[PDB]
Amino acid sequence: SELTQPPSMSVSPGQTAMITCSMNKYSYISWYQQRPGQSPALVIYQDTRRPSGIPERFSGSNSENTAILTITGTRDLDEADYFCQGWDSNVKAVLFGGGTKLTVLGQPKAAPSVTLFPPSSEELQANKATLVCLISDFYPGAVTVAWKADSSPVKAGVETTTPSKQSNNKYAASSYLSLTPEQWKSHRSYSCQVTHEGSTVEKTVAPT
Amino acid sequence: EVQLVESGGGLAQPGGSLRLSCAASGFTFRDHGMTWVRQVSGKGLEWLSYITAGSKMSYYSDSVRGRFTISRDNAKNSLYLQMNGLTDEDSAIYYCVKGGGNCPSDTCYPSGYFGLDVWGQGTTVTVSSASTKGPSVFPLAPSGGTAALGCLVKDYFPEPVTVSWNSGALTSGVHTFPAVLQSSGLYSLSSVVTVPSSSLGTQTYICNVNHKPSNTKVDKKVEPK
Amino acid sequence: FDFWVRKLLIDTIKWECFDKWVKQKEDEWTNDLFDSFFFQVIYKFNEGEAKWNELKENLKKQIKVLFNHIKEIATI
Ligand SMILES: [Zn+2]
Ligand SMILES: [Zn+2]
Ligand SMILES: [Zn+2]
Ligand SMILES: [Zn+2]
Ligand SMILES: [Zn+2]
Ligand SMILES: [Zn+2]
């Protein structure tokens, strides 16, 4: 007794998206949309009905053991996860589908905004030092970060997040370099180098 | 209008136990069924349990059967989930959800016919052998235009922390980043806000950090220079 | 009165000694509507949701209207 969805699906803007959800025995089917960093929201219920507030592009259907969420005129803000949901009468249990990441093609390149902070003096009083490299508002979501002590690569003490999708479909990430207050004081400068779509943005701080 | 607010999340030990609560408001709590749904970060939705409006019926997933117990008190607009036997596969965001439709004579269930029509922001539960660790909050200070400045929230466990600025009265230009999980097993995040350079001498900038699991609440001031 | 429509709907499904039932209710007589009865009609009913679906399919086609389905039920 399983609701089966495609993991991912892509669509061009204004094109019609059709997410399918196949099942073994009939159930009524509700559909939920989850936008980055947010709770699910109910988008279609009773196979074909939409709650007040859901745009008329969203429509649903259920026949021959397959339900379809249909979005006509897909926009940028339709980029989300979508889950179908049914019921198993014979074990009394909710069924959820795996989910479908809907991707809308042709969004424009956005280069990252990069801010570099040096160790605070509070943190140096406690015999620690951390460099914080914050990276926001970039698309598509794949950056490389490298760190330079003066101009020498740094390999130990680097923790970088994987890119994370914000509300506006762009990405944020952060990198941290941990070092001793001795290494900090003993170099002329440290550098964050962010590579995005071939280009590198460097930012630099120095103990002075 | 309608509001589902979860609490009781936090850290637990393998085999240990937790109890989440939900305060409901905005609608007739007794008229409607209620349910918990959880979500591991970056994965699908898993339904856990559902309680009829008069508490006389209860449905469960086989994954939480005889380990979790749902309940409700209609006097206080409240829904409860008692969890025992916690494993690491139980660490997730737990949502309190309003059943769609009505509930006559304890006959409602979470059907695709009405679906689940209001979800809460959810609460994070973490099941670990590690110990609660509260963060050190450090200021990130700024150098005709604007200046970046913010707070480093360093080495804490478990998630989550929340960050605001000037008790919430500052919101424009604020990025609070997803936390890194370091190989030590602790988290760090940062929050930066871009502000006008000419405000540094005369406007105060306080970042309010709050790590509920360790009852840490820090209010740290970011001075220039 | 809400009670009688419910029992009319329950029994309209259980069928599908019947010719007596139609007359009795036929005499007794003298969208959101159906939503309100969904849980009560199909409680613990095996395969209830598909049954309720057939029922609303016929209520769709015949664009008080539950009685005509009973004459269409009695076609066979
Ligand atoms: Zn931004
Ligand atoms: Zn070096
Ligand atoms: Zn209500
Ligand atoms: Zn495990
Ligand atoms: Zn009678
Ligand atoms: Zn029929």
CA-based end-to-end distance of chain C:
29
CA-based end-to-end distance of chain A:
66
For residue A149, the CA-to-ligand 2 centroid distance in Å is 5
Q: Please tell me if the domain spanning A8-104 has the same topology as the one spanning A113-205.
A: yes
Query: How many Cα atoms occupy the beta-carbon half-sphere of B193 within 13 Å?
Result: 23
Nearest Cβ partner for A115 among B148, B182, B189: B148
* A182 C-beta neighbours (distance < 10 Å), count: 10
Q: What is the CATH number of the domain that holds B165?
A: 2.60.40.10
Closest CA to B22 of B39, B5, B46, B45: B5
In chain A, residues with a C-beta closer than 8 Å to the C-beta of C48 are 89
Closest CA to B8 of B16, B19, B17: B19
Angle between helices C48-61 and C66-73 (to 10 degrees): 100
Closest chain B residue to the Cα of A156, Cα to Cα: B183
CB-based contact B105 C40, cutoff 8 Å: yes
Distance CA C67, CA B119 (A): 39
Burial readout C17-38 (b: 16 or more C-beta within 10 A, e: otherwise): eeeebbeebeeeeeeeeeeebb
CB-based contact C53 A28, cutoff 8 Å: yes
Query: How many Cα atoms occupy the beta-carbon half-sphere of B122 within 13 Å?
Result: 22
In chain B, residues with a C-beta closer than 8 Å to the C-beta of C2 are none
Distance CA A147, CA B201 (A): 33
DSSP states along A112-126:
PEEEEE---HHHHHT
Q: CATH number of the domain at A113-205, please?
A: 2.60.40.10
Measure in Å the smallest separation between the Cα of B164 and chain A Cα atoms: 17
Cα-based angle B156, B162, B163 (whole degrees, multiple of 5): 105
Size of interface A-B (CB pairs under 8 A): 132
Judge if B33 and B73 occupy the same domain: yes
Three-state DSSP at C76 gives: coil
Do the Cβ atoms of B80 and B20 come closer than 8 Å?
yes
Fold adopted by A8-104: Immunoglobulin-like (2.60.40)
For residue B60, the CA-to-ligand 3 centroid distance in Å is 24
Query: Solved by what technique?
Result: X-ray
CB-based contact C53 A89, cutoff 8 Å: no
**Burial of A208 per CB tally in 10 Å (0-12, 13-18, 19+):** exposed
Query: How many Cα atoms occupy the beta-carbon half-sphere of C41 within 13 Å?
Result: 26
Single residue among B127, B153, B174 that ends a domain in this structure: B127
Q: What share of chain B is helix, strand, coil (3-state, %, to 5)?
A: 10, 50, 40
Chain B 131-160, residues with CB within 8 Å of chain A CB atoms: 136, 138-141, 148, 150, 152, 154
In chain B, residues with a C-beta closer than 8 Å to the C-beta of C38 are 101, 111, 113-114
Do the Cβ atoms of A87 and A27 come closer than 8 Å?
yes
Do the Cβ atoms of A83 and A71 come closer than 8 Å?
no
Three-state DSSP at C53 gives: helix
In chain A, residues with a C-beta closer than 8 Å to the C-beta of B61 are 93-94
Q: What is the resolution of this structure in A?
A: 2.7
For chain A, give every domain's residue range.
8-104, 113-205
CA distances from B37 to B16, B122, B208 (A): 20, 9, 30
Is the backbone of residue C38 left (phi > 0), alpha (psi -120 to 50) or beta?
A: alpha
**SS3 letters for B100-140?**
CCCCHHHCCCCCCCCCEEEECCCEEEEECCCCCECCEEEEE
Judge if B84 and B191 occupy the same domain: no
Judge if B72 and B183 occupy the same domain: no
Looking at the CA of A135, which ligand is closest? 1
Judge if B167 and B62 occupy the same domain: no
Distance CA A156, CA B36 (A): 43
Sort strands B34-39 and B92-99 into parallel, antiparallel or unpaired: antiparallel
Q: How many domains does chain B have?
A: 2
Touching check for C46 and chain A: CB below 8 Å?
Answer: yes
Ligand 5 ion: nearby residues, β-carbon < 5 Å: C 24
Looking at the CA of A189, which ligand is closest? 2
Judge if B24 and B109 occupy the same domain: yes
CA dihedral A106, A112, A113, A117 (to 10 degrees): 150
Query: How many Cα atoms occupy the beta-carbon half-sphere of C9 within 13 Å?
Result: 28
The pair of structure tokens assigned to B12 is 């637990």
Phi, psi of B192 (to 5 degrees): -125, 145
In chain B, residues with a C-beta closer than 8 Å to the C-beta of A45 are 100, 112-115, 117
Judge if B98 and B31 occupy the same domain: yes
Judge if B96 and B184 occupy the same domain: no
Judge if B45 and B18 occupy the same domain: yes
The pair of structure tokens assigned to C55 is 């029922």
The pair of structure tokens assigned to B154 is 């360093």
Domain that includes residue B174, residue range: 136-221
Do the Cβ atoms of B86 and B68 come closer than 8 Å?
no
Judge if B22 and B123 occupy the same domain: yes
Continuous segment of H or E residues that includes residue C42: helix C38-42
